[PDB]
Point group: C2
Chain length 578, copies 2
Amino acid sequence: MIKRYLQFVKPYKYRIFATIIVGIIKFGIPMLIPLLIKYAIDGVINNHALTTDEKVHHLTIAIGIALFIFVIVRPPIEFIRQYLAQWTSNKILYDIRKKLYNHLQALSARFYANNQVGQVISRVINDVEQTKDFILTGLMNIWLDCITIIIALSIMFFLDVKLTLAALFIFPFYILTVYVFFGRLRKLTRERSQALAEVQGFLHERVQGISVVKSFAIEDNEAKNFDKKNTNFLTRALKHTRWNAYSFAAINTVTDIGPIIVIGVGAYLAISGSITVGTLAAFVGYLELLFGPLRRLVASFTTLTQSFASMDRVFQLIDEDYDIKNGVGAQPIEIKQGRIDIDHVSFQYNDNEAPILKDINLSIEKGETVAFVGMSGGGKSTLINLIPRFYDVTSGQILIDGHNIKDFLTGSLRNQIGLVQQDNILFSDTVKENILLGRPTATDEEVVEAAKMANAHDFIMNLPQGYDTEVGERGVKLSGGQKQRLSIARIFLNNPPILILDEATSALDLESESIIQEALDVLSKDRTTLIVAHRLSTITHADKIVVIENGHIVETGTHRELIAKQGAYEHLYSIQNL
Amino acid sequence: MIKRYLQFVKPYKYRIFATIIVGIIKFGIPMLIPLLIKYAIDGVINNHALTTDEKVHHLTIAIGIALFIFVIVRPPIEFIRQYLAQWTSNKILYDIRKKLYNHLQALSARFYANNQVGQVISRVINDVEQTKDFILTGLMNIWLDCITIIIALSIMFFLDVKLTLAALFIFPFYILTVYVFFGRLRKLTRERSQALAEVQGFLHERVQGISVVKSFAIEDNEAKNFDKKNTNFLTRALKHTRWNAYSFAAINTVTDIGPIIVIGVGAYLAISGSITVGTLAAFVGYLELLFGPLRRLVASFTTLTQSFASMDRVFQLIDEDYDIKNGVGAQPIEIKQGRIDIDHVSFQYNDNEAPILKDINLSIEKGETVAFVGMSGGGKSTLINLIPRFYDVTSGQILIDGHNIKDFLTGSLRNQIGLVQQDNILFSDTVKENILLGRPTATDEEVVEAAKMANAHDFIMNLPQGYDTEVGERGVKLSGGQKQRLSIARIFLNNPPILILDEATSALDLESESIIQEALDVLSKDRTTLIVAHRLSTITHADKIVVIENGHIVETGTHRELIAKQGAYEHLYSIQNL
């Protein structure tokens, strides 16, 4: 998996090597200070053989050299070091999200039917952000602390063989301890993030559905439900905290026995006649070089553990399967004559549940306008959505122009099916911007046409700032009949070969309906049109009315014929002016 | 404003003092090492008074002691120090969100009509989280670095009053520099966060409206729109980064001239007689004590700057005004007889725009069932929503039982108005859980009753896992007629004195409608009922039909009378059979 995440860093290796290089070229600075203390002390006064005009000159090139380095050289190193580090990771994150967003747009209705927006977003934003430390603390700092440890171990190896050994004794345990915690922290972090994710999901869902919370004044009740999730998150976060605290003390207690098992030994050797009490003096001086980095790495460790948890969650989301896939055979197909064929189609949203569409057989020739009617919960919408291939038929096949829906390239198929769903969407944008969804590359002229078509153009003008009026989030700032008509607009703009209208009149008064009815009868003149309707009267003119009951096609016919049959259809119609 | 944020920390002062105390009791440890070293070296090795059996002995007491401290005392200090620090801040955050969520639930339809969920959430989650550093780096660490600086400075002053003035020389500039950057970083951070906020808002809106993006296969187009926001965020984040890098190098270059100017003057002063090398050398070992903390504080500074930006944004959201406020006169009023009076009401959603409801006068006696009908975009919904007081009338008054709506306590008023909006809501929960929204404290028996009432109980049973079937996010896993009926359920459960039904039939077939029609005619027998409808036929029985046009009441009457008048009403009705 590191290999995976690494793939994102790939195009930035150099900038990172650079960040590490400049990183090393930093320790040289802190050492310049103690080096300068020795020069004035031993090179201008303790020299004893210099003029009081000569030594007061060397101190003006040494207090000259220092200033130069620190006021000219260091600043740029400092800067670049950070800017680089950041610029790098920040571009990397940017990249990861670029990919995550396409992933998302490629998931299926199913995915989104069983997932919580807020939770998904939490991953795309929070979890990703969290993997930032892995680039910084991981690939750009950890090393410097190991380089330091090598240098140190090395220097010490010369000063004395067994004395260094005296130190390394700790090392294995240190490693063992880290290993012992790592995993548990990784989970605790994972579980923690997830909780956050769930509060995200909660906030999203409620803030957007407040209309309801407000209406029944269930604020108190819901504020509780919030606290459960908010508390859960807190709890989990504490578990996580406790362990980090715990593991920290642990790893360090180990890292601390380090200088001890050293000093102790360093004495019982210098006195036992093994080595120069100067060696002991020197060696023990470097103790900070060894058990210093080892102490930092404890922190480095921790940070990373958390980061891994995050990249987990990220990849987990990345690894989600696309339910509707294109498959090798993919083929952008032009639909020249709207010929739709539904052969023995049967649908189930899940293996466990019962099918919703059982055995459906229906043929629709180009130009025909087919109406779908029946008790609510029958299957019309489900059936319908099988064509734009929003879900794949369970058993059977649907063919447009003889071509199996599956053999089209998604975008192609979908782009040629103008679909007005029953629960229509609007983004917090301008009226124009919304219609444009039907055909983003459209002439401000064509838009106004679609509008006039959908019987929308008129009320749009009466809107403050007309076609540029910002509709509300979710399109709140408009009537039902109004939102709806904008959806119809999109259709005309799309001007597709196949038109599916699932209750495209729901919210319009009798009059507006009449208009749109005419507008459509026109657009639907020579196109294959599928219509789901409850207001029967606006379906009579259909070429064929299809009655659907409990997932089955029960009746088929012309309004005229169906009425004669005094069957299922008539029953329903008959309920109107009776 | 710090005072504000502090108010959240208040109930945790002690835990924080504690965190600081234990914090100080830490420097004592690192010093024990060199002490065990000096003690070994200068104490046992060169005592010139030690039996080889004594020195070894006194060495041992120094180690047995070391191990004890480090393997027993330190671990607990380490732990508590961190656990404390975290536990504290983590509870504080928890608290802040507890408050933010109630704030949210108290904002008005307006607020939410002009705000983006994702953006709001970003604040409640991200910005808050960000204020975490302020508690940690701010109130628990900064101090230790100042304590260190005091300790250090004192020593310098008793070592030489005029050389500490060679040090402190830097101090003012340091402060000046911080001041110079602080502000700009604060903004850059602010602007950065906001960008994130906007990507949040984008992701929310799109992920939830994908149905549309999928239908027109506008993935590519939208993926672009995403990249604008994603890029914007990246850019802003870079600006921020660049400056931090910049300001960092700056403040340090200043902090670095520090040890130098002590050496530049200090050395010159030794020459002229200020003091000797014995002093110049001793006034230089502690240099790390002074310009060490000053270097850390540079980082401490930065972190805080960002934190302030965050608390800004947080408070900004906290400072949002409640459009619908209760006001002192608040009074939980029982509505005993649904008498509604609309006296010269006029409504405008904004001062700039044109009114939507102009001069409306209508009286509704207890028990009466009043229907509202007219072209779409007329004002019915707006009018209606003025009663549950979702917005306050602009000019006029609405009185229930003689009491002005404004004089009720929100929850009271709203709780007694059973409202079925046209765009009904469902949470990703169970069927039961959703109905329960109408009356959270309800008998699993009463629920099933409401259901049977709303003509829902039946199809709910046919659902996998029946009343416990998890409907989809937004309630996707159900038909239109189905979601809707669950909304109707809520009404029966609420069983209020006043019932408002805005197109409560939109998605039901003719048959289901008949049922619910009967179910309601019953529930509406002796209750004040307001109905907005487009399917006229389901309104005929009304006590009074009110026709609304361009924000006005144009006609008033009984279906019978209005039909006779051959006016506005008849026109519309007349369009059904015609």
